[PDB]
């Protein structure tokens, strides 16, 4: 399935190269710019714990998720991963707990030391 494909084939986009955030580009975007710290970013996504159990999707709010990139308003792996993406791109990320909610986790959605999987669609990004 999607996560195994990432484990097996995905690129390690961490600085430390600790395989904490792996990425596969599933749909190539158009345009060359990937967004900078402080950019306002518009996405669709779906996420799940790597072993099923809990699930979340922007389409469940019928609206894109919007955040400010690189300000830690999202988990580290998103600040890292979404910055590598181009407008129109769809990507798969698989994330170790260290770039997500660590050992403390976050009930009720997230257990301790959870690995997470997302599909992210970068819709757009604007300057701050």
Ligand X SMILES: COc1cc2cc(c1OC)OC[C@H](CO)OC/C=C/[C@@H](C)[C@@H](C)OC(=O)[C@@H]1CCCCN1C(=O)[C@H]2C1CCCCC1
* Catalytic residue set: 45, 55-56, 75, 101, 118
Cis amide prior to 108 (ω within 30 degrees): yes
DSSP 65: E
Among residues 30 and 107, whose Cβ is nearest to ligand X?
107
Distance in Å, CB of 106 to ligand X, minimum: 4
Which residue's CB is nearer to ligand X, number 1 or number 30?
Answer: 1
**DSSP 8-state assignment for residue 21:** E
Closest to ligand X by CB, 90 vs 110, is 110
- Are the C-beta atoms of 33 and 53 separated by less than 8 Å? no
Residues that bind ligand X (CB under 6 A): 45, 47-49, 54-56, 74-75, 78, 106, 109-110, 116
Residue ranges of alpha helices (H) inside the chain are: 2-9, 76-82
For 67, list phi and psi in degrees, rounded to 5: -155, 170
For residue 14, give the 3-state DSSP assignment. Answer: coil
Partners of residue 24 on adjacent β-strands:
92
């Amino acid at each position: 399935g999607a996560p195994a494909t990432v484990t097996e084939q995905g690129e390690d986009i961490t600085s430390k190269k600790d395989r904490g955030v792996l990425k596969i580009v599933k749909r190539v975007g158009n345009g060359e710019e990937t967004p900078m710290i402080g950019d306002k970013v518009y996405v669709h996504y779906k996420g799940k714990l790597s072993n099923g159990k809990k699930f979340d999707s922007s389409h469940d709010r019928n609206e894109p998720f919007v955040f400010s990139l690189g300000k830690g308003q999202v988990i580290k792996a998103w600040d890292i991963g979404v910055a590598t993406m181009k407008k129109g791109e769809i990507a798969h990320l698989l994330i170790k707990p260290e770039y997500a909610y660590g050992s403390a986790g976050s009930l009720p959605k997230i257990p301790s030391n959870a690995t997470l999987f997302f599909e992210i669609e970068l819709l757009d990004f604007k300057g701050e």
